[PDB]
């Protein structure tokens, strides 16, 4: 495995560099490639032959090499550049490729975006299947870190809660979802249930009630 830093950070509009260290039998052979893996999207070839930009790669991505350490340099950093970056190089065979350990890029200076919360009650169909799921959908927020708490009436609920780790949407904002699984009896017996979404010190609470149909 080629050695890369675990993570790097650069501010918006500025420039960051990611190194790729190996031996004279891989990186030294002078044909290093670079790949961009954005969460959810297919990998993208950035650089090949140390410095040649692949088809469609903007000029902002620059590759270089000195000896057994290659470097990817990203300039005019944009939020869309956050991704896992991997280098690669053949080793003793054109059909024996070695990848780097990967580097996570954090673009700094991105402004706060507050979450929008949509809470759905259990459908009538699910209740007839003798199940009940409350669905709390959380969209359009940055940074990708939320805490989700659930309330039955006004009492906290910890059992039956399943919450995703936030992941990045297409618009550079994050999405997350939280699910509360109940029996139809529990759902019907309470006056309401609440999803409380806390993001950057502020909490959005949405509430649903079995009485509403």
């Amino acid at each position: 495995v080629l050695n890369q830093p675990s993570s790097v950070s650069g501010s918006l509009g500025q420039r960051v560099s990611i190194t790729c260290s190996g031996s004279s039998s891989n990186v030294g052979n002078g044909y290093v490639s670079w790949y961009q893996l954005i969460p959810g999207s297919a990998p993208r070839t950035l650089i090949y032959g140390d410095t040649s930009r692949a088809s469609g790669v903007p000029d902002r991505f620059s590759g270089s090499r000195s000896g057994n350490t290659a470097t990817l340099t990203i300039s005019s950093l944009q939020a869309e550049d956050e991704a896992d970056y991997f280098c690669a190089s053949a080793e003793d065979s054109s059909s024996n490729a070695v990848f780097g350990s990967g580097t996570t890029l954090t673009v700094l200076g991105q402004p706060k975006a507050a979450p929008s919360v949509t809470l759905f009650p259990p459908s009538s169909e699910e209740l007839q299947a003798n199940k009940a799921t409350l669905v709390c959908l959380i969209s359009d927020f940055y940074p990708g870190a939320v805490t989700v708490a659930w309330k039955a009436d006004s009492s906290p609920v910890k059992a039956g809660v399943e919450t995703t780790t936030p992941s990045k949407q297409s618009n550079n904002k994050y999405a997350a979802s939280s699910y509360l699984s109940l029996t139809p009896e529990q759902w019907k017996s309470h006056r309401s249930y609440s999803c409380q979404v806390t993001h950057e010190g502020s909490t959005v609470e949405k509430t649903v009630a079995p009485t509403e149909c």
Binding site: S33, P43, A90, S94, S95, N96, E162, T164, S167, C213
Partner: protein
């Protein structure tokens, strides 16, 4: 355009053989080499192997004993088999066109070194600071560039979309699809969010479209949660005019290929 499509089971039992297939389009398998690459959750890209235009295969040496790549130019397919898999083999699997070339004659000297022919024995590379005809000796950090300087070029050209594969002893489960109808208080003025709940399926992945793909704007399909039960759930919502919640047809198209399940769930408006 060059396109690659992976197919095969998204679920394999431990110790079984995982077999995938890559469908080519936009080129001939007799013109480009095709290779396989996988990324396990959280880990780094890992090379698997490739088969060049001549049907000759190269593999990851640590995995070679368990790998096997075949090709049929006629059907325009590339296959991959991995034997005796375990949880370690759960990953997204890509096929891709790859560049592979062995080059010779690279007598260029690295940075900090200088090409010279005034060495004992002819031409080579010396440290730029070294002075004398012995600077191409190992004792002085140089070398003679005599004969065979084979350099190997590799890079992935066009990446496939990637097939999710889970290796587990847990059994498949098709999803329960439930409508997510907005009520009279959950709207958002001139628009409203309606959706579908895709509950308790195993393994990944699931896809959702709306109205057979004719409705794309305002569609937001959320990533799945992995529940303590080992089952997955995800939701997909679309934002539409509130005026049309009860006059326009809205249907989510759920596809869970691992269980061979498709559901078209028509979402009706709630009364209150």
């Amino acid at each position: 355009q060059v396109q690659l499509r992976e197919s095969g089971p998204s679920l394999v039992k431990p110790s079984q053989t995982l077999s995938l297939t890559c469908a080519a389009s936009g080129f001939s398998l007799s013109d480009k080499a095709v290779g396989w690459v996988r990324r396990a959750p959280g880990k780094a890209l890992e090379w698997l192997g490739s088969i060049d235009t001549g049907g000759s295969t190269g593999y990851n040496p640590g995995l070679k004993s368990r790998l096997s790549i075949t090709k049929d130019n006629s059907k325009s397919q590339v296959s991959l088999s991995i034997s005796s898999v375990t949880s370690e083999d759960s990953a997204t699997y890509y096929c891709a066109t790859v560049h592979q070339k062995t080059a010779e004659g690279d007598k260029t000297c690295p940075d900090g070194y200088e090409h010279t022919c005034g060495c004992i024995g002819g031409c080579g590379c010396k440290r730029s600071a070294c002075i004398g005809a012995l600077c191409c000796q190992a004792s002085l950090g140089g070398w003679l560039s005599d004969g065979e300087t084979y350099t190997y070029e590799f890079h992935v050209d066009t990446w496939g979309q990637g097939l999710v594969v889970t290796v587990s002893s847990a059994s498949t489960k098709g999803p329960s699809v439930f409508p997510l109808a907005p009520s009279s208080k959950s709207t958002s003025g001139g628009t409203a969010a309606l959706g579908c709940l895709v509950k308790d399926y195993f393994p990944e992945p699931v896809t959702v479209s709306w109205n057979s793909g004719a409705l794309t704007s305002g569609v937001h399909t959320f990533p799945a949660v992995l529940q303590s039960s080992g089952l997955y759930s995800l939701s997909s919502v679309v934002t539409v005019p509130s005026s049309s919640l009860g006059t326009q047809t809205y249907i989510c198209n759920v596809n869970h290929k691992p269980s061979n399940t498709k559901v078209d769930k028509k979402v009706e408006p709630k009364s209150c």
